[PDB]
């Protein structure tokens, strides 16, 4: 029995999926159809399944949501950002004037192509009948060229003009350069004996690619045939015959001569004196920084670009400071980096799989003479699709390169002797608000004080969008339930008059222009009363009541919204 | 009668004042995350049955969590 409920008009945009979500003491079974499962009950008309949903030639699995939520030890495979798949219409060729010259080729090839129609059809033992059948083993349109009218024609017609107008769109240049059958003879020539060049395969891939685009946008119009997908995402066993049709064209037309995450320790962890040695793994060789940083560090910006990290980079084999300087060796997939610093003498070393880096001036030290400073934190930081492994020690048996370099020298584990685990800080990626700062740059935040006002200002010379709010929201009581916005003159808005029980943030999304002296002003008239008074170049910020809301973009529109049933 | 006079004590005060507490928040993005040292530890059947997509959760966890009322957050 359906429950009369149920969130109408809300936001499409995004890729959905189901979720169930626990606390614990709980045994739950998802039910699809076919080897997943059995459904106990009918599914509504038109309302298909998730094992159906699944993309053609692709595995199922469960994850958990986002990230690496698994009871596991040390060996957790950390991750930094990652692509939108990459994949979440065929190329234009008709946009292009057919050029005459070579109208007589369109046709040479076109016959050709109509030849070997009928070739194929009586390698399998088609006749020529007057009906138009496929079991009966027989087709009209096997006659020769002249005879064959504009209603059976106009096919290969076509099919020459497409192939042409693709390769004058991909960027080459078109130019100057037996089975006894039923009353007709294909034999134009032995054109399967020159050696089609890679460059002509790779075309004649590229025309079987356009042509199965047409074909699927004209086939999505019906069910769910597992080949509406396009062709690279296409099984490989039908791969080649697509191709073979189209390789005949260029046959023909040449025998006939023509964001990144940071990751660090707990700041109490620091050290300011004695030998330290971490381990940092990583299964690929992408963009992946590794080195000791300052508590201080920025969790945004890049990883020693300060003087609050000092770092190293094997994705350029580049010691990271302020500034950059090549040092060292680049790693590839599946490698290890072991990382030292002794703070008695200010020296950091890195060792790739044992082997000490050694820089342009054949000095093995990487840096020297830094301030202690408060302490220095192990950190690294992951690119796009990169993920990678810690190891702060506690795990001998597991360390390899350690009797390599470090036991001798006096060099210890950063963890050695630690009853429990690290906690293993991480930046994260929800931007919430934060009070603006005094010292912060190209954003300034005054207070004056009749009224009170609370003015603006900024010093810079790149332009983006900010998110202002205001501190302690307006909660609403059980019967109150509605927010107008005047402008200068009357109140002319959204209705916005929806909140049972609810607390609105009052909050502003100015843009920065070179002169911002925007602000906000709390006044009175007959009620709450919030004036964000503005200037010039007026047309792009907002001024509203907001919720709590962490999303960092520049939209107008597309915002959350839902309405319950 | 006022935005001051409704999320503050005095609510009989028509005179539009600021606290200190009404300071302007901007959307930032230094912040970090803490990574628990103990997860839920959901095992999954791994059989993928005729009957269905088995997973089960039996050992509980607990923490607590401080709650910002005048930001509305939990920590």
Same mark, same amino acid.
Request: charged letters at 35%; glycine letters at 0%.
């Given at each position: 029995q359906p429950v009369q409920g149920m969130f109408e008009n809300f936001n499409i945009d995004g890729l959905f999926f189901p979720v169930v979500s626990f606390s614990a003491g709980i045994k739950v079974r998802f039910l699809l159809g076919g080897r997943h499962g059995e459904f106990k009950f009918l599914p509504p008309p038109g309302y298909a399944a998730c094992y159906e949903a699944v993309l053609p030639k692709e595995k199922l699995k469960v994850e958990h949501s986002r990230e690496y939520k698994q009871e596991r030890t040390y060996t957790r495979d950390l991750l930094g950002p990652t692509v939108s798949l990459t994949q979440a219409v065929p190329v234009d060729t008709s946009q292009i004037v057919l050029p005459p010259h070579l109208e007589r080729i369109r046709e040479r090839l076109a016959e050709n192509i109509h030849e070997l129609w009928v070739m194929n059809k009586i390698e399998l033992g088609w006749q020529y009948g007057p009906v138009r059948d496929d079991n009966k083993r027989q087709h009209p349109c096997l006659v020769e060229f002249c005879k064959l009218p504009e209603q059976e024609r106009n096919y290969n017609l076509q099919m020459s003009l497409e192939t042409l107008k693709t390769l004058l769109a991909l960027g080459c240049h078109v130019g100057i350069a037996y089975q006894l059958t039923s009353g007709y003879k294909p034999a134009?020539?032995? @054109?399967?004996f020159i050696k089609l060049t890679p460059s002509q395969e790779a075309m004649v891939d590229k025309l079987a690619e356009n042509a199965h685009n047409v074909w699927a946008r004209d086939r999505? !119009?019906? !069910? !769910?045939?597992? !080949? @509406?997908?396009?062709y690279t995402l296409l099984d490989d066993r039908t791969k080649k015959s697509n191709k073979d049709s189209l390789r005949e064209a260029v046959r023909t037309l040449l025998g006939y001569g023509y964001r990144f995450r940071i990751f660090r320790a707990e700041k109490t962890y620091a050290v300011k004196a004695g030998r330290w040695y971490f381990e940092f793994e990583a299964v690929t060789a992408g963009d992946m920084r590794v080195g000791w940083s300052r508590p201080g560090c920025q969790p945004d910006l890049e990883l020693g670009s300060d003087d609050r990290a000092f770092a190293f980079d094997g994705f350029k084999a580049q010691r990271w400071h302020q500034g950059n300087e090549h040092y060292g060796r680049s790693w590839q997939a599946g490698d290890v980096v072991g990382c030292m610093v002794d703070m008695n003498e200010h020296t950091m070393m890195f060792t790739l799989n044992g082997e000490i880096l050694l820089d342009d001036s054949g000095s093995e030290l990487a840096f020297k003479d830094f301030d202690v400073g408060d302490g220095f934190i192990p950190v690294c930081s992951l690119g796009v699709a990169q993920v990678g492994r810690m190891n702060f020690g506690k795990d001998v048996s597991t360390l390899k390169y350690f009797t390599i370099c470090g036991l001798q020298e006096g060099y210890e584990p950063f963890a050695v002797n630690t009853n429990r685990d690290i906690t293993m800080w991480l930046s994260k990626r929800l931007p919430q608000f934060l009070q603006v700062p005094s010292?912060?740059?190209h954003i300034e935040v005054t207070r004056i004080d009749k009224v009170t006002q609370k003015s603006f200002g900024s010093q810079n010379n790149n332009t983006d969008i900010m998110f202002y709010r205001l501190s302690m929201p307006i909660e609403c009581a059980x019967x109150x339930x509605x927010x107008x916005x005047x402008x200068x003159x009357x109140x002319x808005x959204x209705x916005x008059x929806x909140x049972x029980x609810x607390x609105x943030x009052d909050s502003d999304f100015e843009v920065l222009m070179k002169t911002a002296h925007g602000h906000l002003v709390p006044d009175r008239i007959d009620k709450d009363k919030e004036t964000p008074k503005p200037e010039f170049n007026n047309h792009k910020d907002y001024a509203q009541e907001k919720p709590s809301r962490l999303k960092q973009x520049x939209x107008x529109x597309x915002x959350x919204x839902x309405x319950x049933x | 009668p006022l935005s001051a006079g409704l999320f503050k004590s005095e609510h009989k005060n028509p005179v539009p004042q600021c606290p200190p507490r009404l300071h302007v928040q901007f959307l930032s993005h230094v912040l970090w995350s803490r990574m628990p040292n103990q997860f839920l530890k959901v095992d999954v059947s791994?059989?993928?049955?005729r009957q269905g997509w088995l997973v089960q959760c039996l050992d509980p966890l607990q923490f607590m969590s401080l709650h910002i009322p005048e930001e509305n957050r939990s920590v």
């Open positions: 134009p020539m032995d @054109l399967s999505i !119009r019906q !069910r !769910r045939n597992p !080949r @509406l997908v396009p010292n912060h740059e | 791994r059989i993928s049955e």
